[PDB]
Amino acid sequence: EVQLQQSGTVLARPGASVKMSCKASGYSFTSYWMHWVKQRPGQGLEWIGAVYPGNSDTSYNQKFKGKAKLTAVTSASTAYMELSSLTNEDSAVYYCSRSSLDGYYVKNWCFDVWGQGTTVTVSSAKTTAPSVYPLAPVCGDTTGSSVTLGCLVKGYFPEPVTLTWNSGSLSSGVHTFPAVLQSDLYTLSSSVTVTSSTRPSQSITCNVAHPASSTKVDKKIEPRG
Amino acid sequence: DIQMTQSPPYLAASPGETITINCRASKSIRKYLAWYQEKPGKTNKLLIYSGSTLQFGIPSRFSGSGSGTEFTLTISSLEPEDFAMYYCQQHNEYPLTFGAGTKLELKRADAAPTVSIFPPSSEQLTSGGASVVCFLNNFYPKDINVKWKIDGSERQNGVLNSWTDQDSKDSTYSMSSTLTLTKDEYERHNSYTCEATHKTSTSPIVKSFNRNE
Amino acid sequence: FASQAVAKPYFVFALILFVGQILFGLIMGLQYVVGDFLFPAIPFNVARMVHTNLLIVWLLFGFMGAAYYLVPEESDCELYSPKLAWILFWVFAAAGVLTILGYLLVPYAGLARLTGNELWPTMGREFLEQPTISKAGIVIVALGFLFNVGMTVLRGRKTAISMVLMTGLIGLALLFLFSFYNPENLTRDKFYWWWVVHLWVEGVWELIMGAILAFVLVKITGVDREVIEKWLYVIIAMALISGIIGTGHHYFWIGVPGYWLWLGSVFSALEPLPFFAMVLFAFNTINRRRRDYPNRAVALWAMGTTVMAFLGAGVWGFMHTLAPVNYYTHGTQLTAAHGHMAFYGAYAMIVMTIISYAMPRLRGIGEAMDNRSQVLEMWGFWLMTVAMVFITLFLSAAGVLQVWLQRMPADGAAMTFMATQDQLAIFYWLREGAGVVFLIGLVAYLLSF
Amino acid sequence: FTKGMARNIYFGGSVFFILLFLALTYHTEKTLPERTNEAAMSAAVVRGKLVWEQNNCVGCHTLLGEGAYFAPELGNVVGRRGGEEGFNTFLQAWMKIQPLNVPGRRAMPQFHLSEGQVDDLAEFLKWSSKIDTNQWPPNKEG
Ligand code: HEC
Ligand code: HEM
Ligand code: HEM
Ligand SMILES: CCCCCCCCCCS[C@@H]1O[C@H](CO)[C@@H](O[C@H]2O[C@H](CO)[C@@H](O)[C@H](O)[C@H]2O)[C@H](O)[C@H]1O
Ligand SMILES: CCCCCCCCCCS[C@@H]1O[C@H](CO)[C@@H](O[C@H]2O[C@H](CO)[C@@H](O)[C@H](O)[C@H]2O)[C@H](O)[C@H]1O
Ligand SMILES: [Ca+2]
Ligand SMILES: [Fe+3]
């Protein structure tokens, strides 16, 4: 089976450099162009360049000549991309992918296997644990057949956070939203809808883990008074 | 460089139907146009190359055609696993370039958002900040408008929204809208209102509260 | 003798076909590096079957030419039938041009249907791509020709030269009969396929070459017929003692038992000996020429033939004939390098040698051509021959890199067929350029008439 | 050392080795059923051999390392293209999609084969791939 394994998320400061890898397996590594492609959120795929491991030749999009350096190491069947003098615009997912056709002269072709992508996040921010706030419904305003609760997670860096409700046993009727940047810090929220004879008679707790600062916090939702 | 333009950017459709999507190049790319499928949690999958050649193992319900400047992709009878993002890429010249995508979404019956508003928690207040959160959950279709009002006046600044993708279980969308104020500014006003406008009603869904009680 | 003139249409036709063969080589050589050249009009395999069938047909014509010229002279009488020589010439020439047209004008499978190949499937094997009817036509021509030359030997003076020629000629036509045998089992098919290709080119064709060389040395050298004929027997003895079990060097990997690994390698290790003997033969008996000869090109052609045959067949053959090496090199550009030099050095060269002796005196010009014509012939000899060494070296270098990239490393580390070929591009351009110098040489050779 | 001696050596040597060779050929013949797994040599494989022949695949490809050197070794292709289970399906797509039309690339023709013929082809190449070949080729690339 032809497979491409990419390295994990890297975080860097503006003006620094990062280097990521792509491990090929299941085919003749030296016989196929390995391409690299950039995807910024909501922005469309861009071809950075390619390396041909059978002779070390490389080819670069003119927009990336300054930015990217591509290499390959034959014995390990692994290709590398180094990105230098980093900027906010280099925050993206970066994919490697294999030409569907073997040989040197098929430089410009389509690709049949892609890696899963490596996230690069370029930021000046410092590692910061989130603040977690319980969201109880509006004071006394209890009426309908179901009740919605929430949990706000505010001011953390870097991604990600994992949020569960009652340690994961409460899982249906949950919406957890993608995080957004507020200045240099991330905020997200999650809602849970449950029937009204469930709460506040039964306990509902928001659990938030931030592996990057080794924090785990529980926030019980309490009716307002 | 050849620019590629895909239309439409979004297309809603149902299982069993046929759709066809478009790809345009800014100059001739002869017959060399490939297509990929993108799905969450999976690597990108080559579907078609050279305009109309099916990639090995791709079901015959996919086909494509075109040459020069204008190309299409057709799926003959949509299957549940076909709702996904689709990208085209020319493979005629250096540098390779890609269109930005058509997202094929699962159509379901229209549903009005369920709307809830949450005052700042007291824990947040003791620390200086005041975030008022509004959830708009399980609505269809995706177009929706949120308006904050403070004492009957429209507030634009300090508002952050975030939107889920189409739920792969009930096919709806959800959104949160958070208005972040200083505790001080929060305390200057009494009446906080979240209003959702959605095609399921000519009239807004309005949820609000008075800072007092 | 007057009926020796029938040799002429054969040599002329052979030279025309030789030109066609080169043009088609040049087409394939470009296809190697511009892979869609002339596609889909003349795909590579179509250009290839034309190149390789024109090689065999032109040599066959040369052989008949050679037999028509020397057999009357050996037998001390007129040829059995000048008019039969002429009917056969037209039938063979017409059948050859028709089948080439077949290949070029109708897609192969359509040609198969059309000639009713499914009744008796002989088509689509290497070197044997001709329709079954077209093969049948070639047998009938061979039978005609054998009767003609054979009747001449019967009523006539028997000599060892003529009798070794007739033996090779008969064995050639008999072995061709295996091309009607197309077993349903792949291994069995390959096994008997080599009874045509190998037992021709390292067997019965060696008798034909040696006998042509022997006759040319009798005529040019004035050395004693007796001593010449003794060596001729030594040479063909070594050819068959080495070469019959030597067929086993084609039996390494086709699916027959591993004893062939031993038998094939040990006996084929000796197949250089008769080419080496032919070199000692021609050098020694030209050094001892009791007389001088007006045509100094024939002598060059004769020494040239034996050296190139020894390089192409003996040296390049030996290089890959041992199983532990052949394991890596089988079906590689190294094979094509050996095949070119061996076919050219032994067989194209001996045909041009007999032509060089016989042409002036078939045209009734004398023993030799004038001095301007003789420098051209020599120029064409050196151009063709040097080009062919370069063709061989370039393909050998390509073969070495191919084996290094594709064949020696393990799975994962070995390069794929198509990627390797791109790495070989440079050697292929050079081969193509060498191929151009060769055609120029062939033009120079032809303008010497 | 005479002409006569040389001629007798030529005679004796040819006859002896001619007889040795036929003896070896007889023996080899008896081993083929096992080496080639002839039990499996089905009607499908034998029709596949005809397809191979009629379209002159060998005019561009090698099989067990014999034929032309323009295109890959097809004796073990089944190992580079989906194996036992998926090779027939691969071959159907492969024959349909030709020529690939990559500029400057070695091109393979469209043969307009029926699906029966391509399936016979696949069985033939699958079966070929299993001949005891004394471990030839060196690796999966042929
Ligand atoms: C030359 C005009 C060819 C003829 C006749 C046949 N094939 Fe071929 N084939 C050819 C080339 C140049 C290539 C490489 C294609 C590429 O772009 O990579 C091929 C390839 C194949 C393959 C795939 C081999 C691999 O290792 O992946 C197969 C299975 C194949 N060809 C089969 C095949 C058959 C069955 C043929 C006779 C009907 C045949 N080919 C003829 C060139 C040519
Ligand atoms: C004039 C005599 C010969 C001619 C015309 C000749 C020609 C050829 C040709 C054309 C091929 C490729 C055949 C094919 O298509 O598979 C070939 C293969 C080969 N020849 Fe010869 N040859 C001759 C003499 C010899 C000699 C004397 C030897 C031994 C020293 C030899 C050893 C080989 C071997 C081992 C192969 C197999 C290569 C492989 O497995 O790829 N040849 N020869
Ligand atoms: C311009 C000169 C030549 C060119 C460019 C040329 C090219 C070629 C090519 C490209 C092939 C096919 C190899 C393949 O299957 O991939 C071939 C086959 C062949 N040619 Fe030539 N050729 C030329 C001259 C000659 C001459 C003079 C001879 C007489 C020896 C010759 C004999 C052969 C033989 C015997 C084969 C089949 C070889 C094999 O199957 O192993 N060619 N030629
Ligand atoms: C004058 C010398 C004459 C020797 C005649 C007898 C030769 C028998 C030797 C075996 S022939 C052939 O050689 C191969 C090794 O070269 C042997 O390959 C071995 O190793 C390979 C990689 O190194 C590996 O791919 C094979 O699977 C492994 O079997 C091969 O089996 C053998 O048949
Ligand atoms: C003019 C002559 C043309 C050049 C061709 C001659 C080359 C033949 C001699 C082959 S030496 C042979 O090389 C083989 C490949 O390196 C080697 O195979 C080995 O290592 C392999 C990994 O590379 C692996 O398959 C096996 O573990 C092992 O068998 C082997 O060491 C060596 O005998
Ligand atoms: Ca061959
Ligand atoms: Fe041989």
Q: Whose CA is nearest to atom 22 of ligand 4?
A: D138
**Cβ pair C281, C302 in contact under 8 A:** no
Q: What are the residues facing A99 on neighbouring strands? A: A111
- Is D5 in CB contact (< 8 Å) with chain B? no
Q: Are residues B55 and B133 in the same domain?
A: no
**For residue A102, what is the nearest residue in chain D, using CA coordinates?**
D105
- Say how far apart CA C429 and CA C32 lie, in whole Å: 9
At C75, list the tokens: 């037998």
Half-sphere exposure of D119 (CA within 13 A, CB side): 6
**Based on the structure, what is the number of domains in chain C?**
1
Query: What residue segments make up the domains of chain A, in order of their start?
Result: 1-124, 125-222
| B49, B55 contact by CB (below 8 A) | yes
Of chain B, the end-to-end C-alpha distance in Å amounts to 61
Same domain, B100 and B140: no
CB A112 within 8 A of CB B43: no
Of the bound ligands, which one is closest to the alpha carbon of residue D70? 3
Three-point CA angle B56, D60, D120, nearest 5°:
55
Q: Which residue type sits at C174?
A: L
CA–CA min distance A75, chain B (Å): 25
Resolution (A): 2.3
H or E segment and range at residue C426:
helix C425-446
Asked if C381 and D110 touch (Cβ cutoff 8 Å), the reply is no
CATH class of A125-222: mainly beta
Considering the domain architecture, whether residues B100 and B146 belong to the same structural domain is answered as no
Token output for A108:
């410009």
Select from B55, B75, B108 the last residue of a domain: B108
Output C245-251 pairs: Cβ under 8 A, ≥24 positions apart: C245/D17, C245/D20, C245/D21, C245/D24, C246/C198, C246/C202, C246/C270, C246/C271, C247/C194, C247/C195, C247/C198, C247/C199, C247/C202, C247/D21, C249/C321, C249/C323, C249/C326, C250/C190, C250/C194, C250/C197, C250/C198, C251/C191, C251/C194
Interchain proximity B31–D100, CB inside 8 Å: no
Q: Which of A144, A175, A170, A180 shows the shortest CA–CA distance to B139?
A: A175
Answer yes or no: do B198 and B154 share one domain: yes
Is residue B55 within 8 A of residue B14, CB to CB? The reply is no
Can you tell me the distance from the alpha carbon of D83 to that of D76, in angstroms, rounded to the nearest whole number?
Answer: 10
CATH for C129: 1.20.210.10
Reply yes or no on domain A1-124 having CATH 3.90.180.10: no
How close B94 gets to chain D, by Cα (Å)? Answer: 14
Of all helices (H) and strands (E), which one includes residue A99?
strand A92-99
Chain-chain contact of D104 with A103 (C-beta, under 8 angstroms):
no
Interface test with C, best of A29, A32, A101, A102 (most C CBs within 10 A): A102
Neighbours of chain A (3+ CB pairs under 8 A): B, C, D
User: With an 8 Å Cβ cutoff, are D102 and A101 in contact?
Assistant: yes
Q: What are phi and psi of B30, to 5 degrees?
A: 45, -120
b/e burial code for range A25-60 (CB count within 10 A of at least 16 → b): eebbbbbbbbbbbbbeeeeebbbbbbbbbbeeeebb
Q: Is D57 annotated as a binding residue?
A: yes
Please state at what angle helix C349-358 crosses helix C371-402, rounded to 10 degrees.
Answer: 180
D4 is in an annotated binding site: no
For the four alpha carbons of C92, C93, C97 and C100, in that order, the dihedral sign comes to positive
End-of-domain residue from the set B108, B141, B175: B108
Cβ-defined contact of D102 to A109 (cutoff 8 Å): yes
Contacts of D102 in chain A (CB under 8 A): 101, 106, 109
Residues of A in contact with D104 (CB under 8 A): 105
Identify the bridge partners of residue B7 per DSSP, sorted by sequence position: B22
Identify the residue whose C-alpha is closest to ligand 4 atom 31.
D135
Q: Is C19 in the pocket of ligand 3 (CB under 6 A)?
A: no
Contact state of D105 with A106 under an 8 Å Cβ cutoff? yes
Obtained via which technique? Answer: X-ray
On whether any CB of chain A is under 8 Å from the CB of D97, the answer is no
Q: Does the distance separating the beta carbons of D104 and A28 come in below 8 Å?
A: no
* Domain enclosing residue C16, as ranges: 1-449
Q: Which two tokens stand for residue C359?
A: 């042409």
Judging contacts by C-beta atoms under 8 Å, the chain D residues touching residue B57 are: 89
Pocket test of ligand 2: the residue of C335, C341, C349 to mutate, having most ligand atoms within 8 Å of its CB, is: C335
b (16+ CB within 10 A) / e for C271-306: bbbbbbbbbebbeebbeeeeeebebebbbbbbebbb
Ligand 4 close to Cβ of residue C324 (< 6 A): yes
Is C319's C-beta closer than 6 angstroms to any atom of ligand 5?
Answer: yes
Instruction: Find the CATH number of the domain harbouring B204.
Output: 2.60.40.10
Tell me the CA end-to-end span of chain C in Å, nearest whole number.
22
Q: Are residues B94 and B115 in the same domain?
A: no
CATH T-level topology, domain D1-142: Cytochrome Bc1 Complex; Chain D, domain 2 (1.10.760)
A205-210 vs A111-114, strand pairing mode: unpaired
D61 labelled binding-site residue: yes
At residue C269, φ and ψ (nearest 5 deg) are: -50, -30
Q: Which domain holds residue B131?
A: 109-211
CB-nearest to D109 from C43, C261, C327 is: C43
- Atom number, ligand 4, closest to the C-alpha of residue C264: 5
Cα C13 to ligand 7 centroid, rounded to whole Å: 28
Range list of H helices, chain B: 122-126, 183-187
Of C347, C244, C357, nearest in space to C294 by CA: C357
B147 and B192 assigned to the same domain: yes
- Enumerate residues 43 to 102 of chain D having a beta carbon within 8 A of any beta carbon in chain B: 89-90, 93, 97, 100-101
Alpha helices in C222-370 (DSSP H): 225-246, 259-268, 272-287, 296-309, 316-321, 323-329, 333-342, 349-358
